[PDB]
């Protein structure tokens, strides 16, 4: 990773700017009065600026770590323990984790629904945290992510928590084949959600039920529309921050 | 009532924020939750999609941190006309495609609060007159 530094501002150098999205670029930061474009892969970019190196603020996130509560369980990091009662999740921290309000919302959620033995389908499952968290109640759960990348952390997740969820590339599509599900959780956009909600229908047993976060409080309007529209009636929402979680029954 | 300590400002693509520079650096810097604003940035900004998207966060003394999206770069939006290869160079001496005086009457109110003009007058003139930099024709 290669920082390019330019000579301007944000809106004196308004015009150049797509051109740098054709290099690579994965952002732009204004400073003093320079602007440092971030790359992948350096190449030829016409304007003359000057490149720097690679190089800090990675490890101030995964030492100051503290588990994450959300009852009934407790997320650590591979490196810590508990003392408590609560259910410990094991997750080794990078590519999505236990501390984000979206997370935590689902994880309780999870514990007032999952039956024991029931079917779950854990959409966009990143980490398998809620994959994971669902075997430890229990239940019988298939993960899938459209990047194929995040799958062996998630099953070296599992392993670590001696659970064995099934994780497979693909969204609902792929699913299809080992449902119908009596749970779906989704941690996703509202826009996704609102897509999606006549294929959550289809994933579902009748009397199934879907609890969905990553739902921004003013975006909710979106999905409680559009559930209402695929025939799921509402069983309950939770709050945290900036975020909700939405639960229905089909 | 909440004391500002920064206004960073911050150009990045729609839903394909990640911890990584810029966005590590200019938060680190000021102690503001990482993690936090990529989900929240990327949750804000999943209605557009590939557009490139400024970005203000104001930083607060507690390290709470809020932020303001905008509209985004009226580049993006003129060569969302003709959105052919990589643009042109910093003296200005490339050619891509072109359009005419009928775009800005429908980007120039996108683009309106921004930088500020009440009237409609002068909305008309600043996009002709950004349509230059690139290689872009108004007839």
Known sequence: ?250 | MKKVVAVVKLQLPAGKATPAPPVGPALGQHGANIMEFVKAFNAATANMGDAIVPVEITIYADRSFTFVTKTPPASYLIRKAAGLEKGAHKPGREKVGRITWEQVLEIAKQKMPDLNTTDLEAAARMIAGSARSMGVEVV
Do not use: C
């Open chain 1, 1 to 250: 990773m290669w920082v390019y530094r330019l000579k301007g501002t944000l809106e004196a150098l308004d015009p150049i700017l797509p051109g740098l999205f054709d290099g690579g670029a994965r952002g732009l930061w204004e400073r003093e009065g320079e602007v440092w474009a971030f790359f992948p892969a350096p190449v030829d970019l016409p304007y003359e600026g000057v490149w720097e190196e690679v190089g800090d603020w990675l490890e101030a996130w995964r030492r100051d770590l503290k588990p994450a509560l959300a009852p009934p369980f407790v997320v650590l990091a591979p490196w810590h323990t508990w003392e408590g009662a609560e259910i410990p999740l094991v997750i080794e921290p990078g590519m999505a984790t236990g501390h984000h309000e979206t997370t935590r919302l689902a994880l309780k959620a999870l514990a007032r629904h999952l039956r024991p033995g029931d079917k779950v389908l854990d959409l966009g499952t990143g980490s398998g945290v809620l994959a994971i968290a669902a075997e430890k109640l229990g239940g019988k759960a298939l993960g899938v992510d459209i990047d194929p990348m995040v799958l062996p952390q998630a099953e070296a997740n599992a392993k670590r928590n001696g659970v064995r969820p099934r994780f497979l590339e693909g969204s609902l599509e792929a699913a299809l084949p080992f449902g119908p599900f009596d749970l779906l959780v989704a941690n996703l956009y509202a826009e996704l959600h609102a897509a999606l909600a006549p294929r959550y229908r289809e994933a579902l047993v009748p009397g199934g039920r879907a609890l969905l976060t990553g739902i921004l409080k003013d975006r909710a309007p979106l999905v409680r529309e559009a559930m209402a529209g695929a025939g799921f009636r509402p069983l309950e929402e939770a709050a945290e921050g900036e975020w909700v979680l939405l639960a229905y029954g089909r």
